[PDB]
């Protein structure tokens with residue numbers, strides 16, 4: 100209704116599991132709030148340059164702006180933070196990319212990003228974190244990190260099922276728990292907020308299946324289920340068990356020496372994939388002390404939220420970390436950082452997260468060559484120390500570049 | 514009934530908030546399972562040596578072994594993992610210390626450590642983490658870390674209120690939620706485990722009050738409330754709000770320039786304490802990238818579990834990290850690592866966590882001089898590179914010591 104669907108350009112098709120991508124696909128993008136105004140222009144410029152370079156003019160993307168967040172209230176009206184047509188358009192055009200979003204406070208509006216993820220049932224939050232040589236890191240050996248985070252995106256405490264303290268509803272569910280379920284474990288039932296953590300068999304098996312398949316297709320060495328299952332037996336503990344059962348039942352997992360770990364043989368390379376588990380607080384130590392031991396990681400919503408941020412900080416990449424939300428019918432690639440409004444319009448922040456989420460987008464489309472030119476671009480620019488302020492602060496001998504100029508620097512190293 | 518209460522020795526008294534400690538107090542200790550057999554002897558030896566040195570023979574501790582875990586089934590019988598008299602004795606004798614505990618699987622027995630904490634309402638899990646010069650660390654600047662973790666210990670998802678998937682009870686509470694509470698947010702209601710997260714006003718204000726008081730008494734620079742309140746509004750979001758309200762209402766917190774942060778003036782040094790908050794996944798990046806910005810940390814049960822492990826790993830201290838569980842009527846100091854059964858009896862693991870929890874125990878008793886001789890001992894031994902296998906593996910020029918020998922090394926540097 101306010102989106103101008105491009106004249107030239109053809110929709111991507113989902114031909115039974117397989118993406119049928121035309122030479123001129125229409126890709127929707129959400130600019131995003133704050134620094135979205137800076138980083139999204141830089142990304143459209145390097146993606147265009149990468150598909151121009153690789154397919155020598157044969158392929159072109161028709162970009163189509165759609166709306167969510169604060170820019171949406173300016174286009175559709177003060178009340179509409181998430182237009183229903185954004186939800187239809189992402190689903191229809193199949194892949195889309197977004198910058199950072201602002202969710203308001205004081206209006207009872209829950210995370211606009213969690214709403215997109217859940218409404219479109221984009222159940223896989225895929226977050227690859229690896230070190231780019233030369234970015235400044237807080238740890239001695241960041242090059243030992245090359246992990247891929249499969250974070251469940253549709254259940255856990257993120258479902259948003261909770262009630263306020265002293266509210267009638269909170270009184271009612273605490274009443275049900277104490278009277279009809281006989282729970283005596285609530286220390287203070289008065290002035291008490293209540294939240295519900297769900298975890299289901301379908302929910303975890305579809306995520307773990309996506310993770311083990313990724314391990315076979317890219318012949319990764321292991322899949323690690325992280326959980327706090329010793330304290331949360333029937334949610335986190337059930338996640339670990341249902342994940343081992345899926346490895347046994349669907350991938351022919353066999354005990355590695357008395358268990359509990361399994362071995363899945365990669366049907367293509369013949370190598371064995373180790374299916375293991377590690378408790379979540381111990382895992383937060385292990386990624387710092389022994390990061391070479393881990394590779395593909397499968398976990399629930401909140402733990403993947405913590406794991407992926409903790410892990411992006413140690414390889415010096417809190418500003419260049421990519422992300423994808425993938426479902427069976429569509430995908431939404433995204434900048435994983437915030438809106439940072441103080442810097443908005445200044446052309447100074449790192450466009451690296453949204454650009455690397457764009458390589459993930461192209462790789463998803465099967466435009467592998469274009470996608471490889473962007474990580475070549477990135478490696479080159481960082482290595483040239485021709486970098487943006489957040490990296491330059493920590494480097495000796497670096498040249499300071501604007502957001503846009505670092506866009507040009509990536510194209511220069513392609 | 515199987516505990517031999519010491520002939521000489523006098524109980525500590527709680528004379529209205531104040532601990533009245535005799536010159537010969539009876540202190541209960543739980544040896545612990547696995548490597549407890551190694552580390553607890555080393556700790557009794559350096560604590561004895563420290564009180565001998567400081568008070569030149571005037572004060573003495575009468576140690577009294579009590580039982581929990583696997584050693585308890587050997588003393589009281591196969592069925593008793595936690596004897597009720599352990600719970601009475603800790604409460605009566607007021608302070609106690611413990612090594613690592615084994616909780617069994619297959620018997621429906623939940624964490625024996627969480628049972629002690631909750632049964633005795635030891636609502637403060639205090640975890641100080643600071644760098645000891647010379648211990649090997651994975652990060653470039655571990656010396657910038659000197660934080661104190663006030664982790665809430667009586668509520669959150671740790672309360673243990675959950676139901677199995679496909680169980681009658683799980684079906685019943687999912688029925689109540691959908692039918693009587695009208696929740697439509699459960700993606701898969703079939704084959705679904707359910708957990709309950711509670712958070713109350715009394716629960717968080719008593720923890721935050723303990724944290725801000727610690728900041729005044731040791732004139733620390735700030736108190737940081739970490740939470741995932743944007744997604745969990747009525748539990749984690751309520752924790753942040755109730756904590757700021759307690760700073761306003763009880764400590765005279767005033768807005769630092771338009772808010773949201775507050776300033777509390779230390780009534781004793783005149784310095785201002787900054788009361789701030791940071792979202793939990795961003796905090797996991799911030800402790801790695803900017804650890805000098807943070808000091809006393811207040812948080813809920815699961816986030817403090819993750820924060821304290823993540824933080825102990827970066828200063829090279831996963832094996833020398835101390836801990837305390839403090840309530841209004843008693844305290845249980847503890848080794849924060851596991852039982853590590855493969856090494857049990859070999860006299861090879863680090864006795865540093867339980868020894869540093871013993872300095873925390875003495876400091877609690879008011880035996881400050883004894884307590885200061887142990888951290889002097891520790892600093893000396895580590896600096897001398899006269900260390901145990903876990904540190905020696907990562908050091909060049911170190912002398913390898915047994916668990917017991919490192920006990921003697923601490924006494925040697927006192």
Ligand SMILES: [Mg+2]
Nearest residue numbers: 404405408794
């Ligand atoms: Mg996050």
Ligand SMILES: [Mg+2]
Nearest residue numbers: 380818819822
């Ligand atoms: Mg822990």
